[PDB]
Amino acid sequence: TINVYEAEDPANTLGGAAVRQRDNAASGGQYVGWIGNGSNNYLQFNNVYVPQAGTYRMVVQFANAEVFNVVDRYCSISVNGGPEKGHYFFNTRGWNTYRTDIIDVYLNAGNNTIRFYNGTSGSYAPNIDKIAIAA
Ligand SMILES: [Ca+2]
Ligand SMILES: [Mg+2]
């Protein structure tokens, strides 16, 4: 681990309906919800800093208890305004149950942005607790 960033960090940008909410079960006692149902309802991590250009592992801590019978939640991930990389996040079976999954990201030396969104009407990303970047 080279850096951890809480979703609710006040440095971050929340668009639209995305919102910081309290959960004692979450890291830092908060998470970001209502990411999705249109690309304007986004979470952007600002100033994700690494010393070297390259591919890193981004460990995402999240909750997803959607049912249709559990289902995955899709999220689009854009690095530095780049093209979306889609990820299907498994079901944690409870909205207060936070697990992790890994997504590879290409970062520049210095500060980077990472945006989480889902542009599909009625479709939501998981709730995001925090991310960690590992070299
Ligand atoms: Ca958190
Ligand atoms: Mg995985």
Type and span of the H or E element at 48? strand 43-50
Please report, for the domain that includes residue 26, its CATH number: 2.60.120.260
Cα 101 to ligand 2 centre (Å)? 5
Instruction: Give the DSSP letter of residue 16.
Output: T
Cα 102 to ligand 2 centre (Å)? 5
Return all residues near 75 (Cβ < 8 A) that are at least 6 apart. 35, 36, 86, 87, 89, 116, 117, 118, 125, 126
At 117, the amino acid letter reads Y
Cα 69 to ligand 2 centre (Å)? 21
Q: Please give the method by which this entry was determined.
A: X-ray
Q: What is the resolution of the experimental data for this entry, in Å?
A: 1.5
Domain of residue 36, residue span? 1-135
Return the ligand number nearest the Cα of 20: 1
Whether 13 and 46 have beta carbons less than 8 Å apart is answered as yes
Give the span between the Cα atoms of 104 and 102, in whole angstroms. Answer: 7
Number of domains present in the structure of the chain? 1
At 104, the amino acid letter reads D
CA distances from 76 to 2, 22, 79 (A): 23, 24, 10
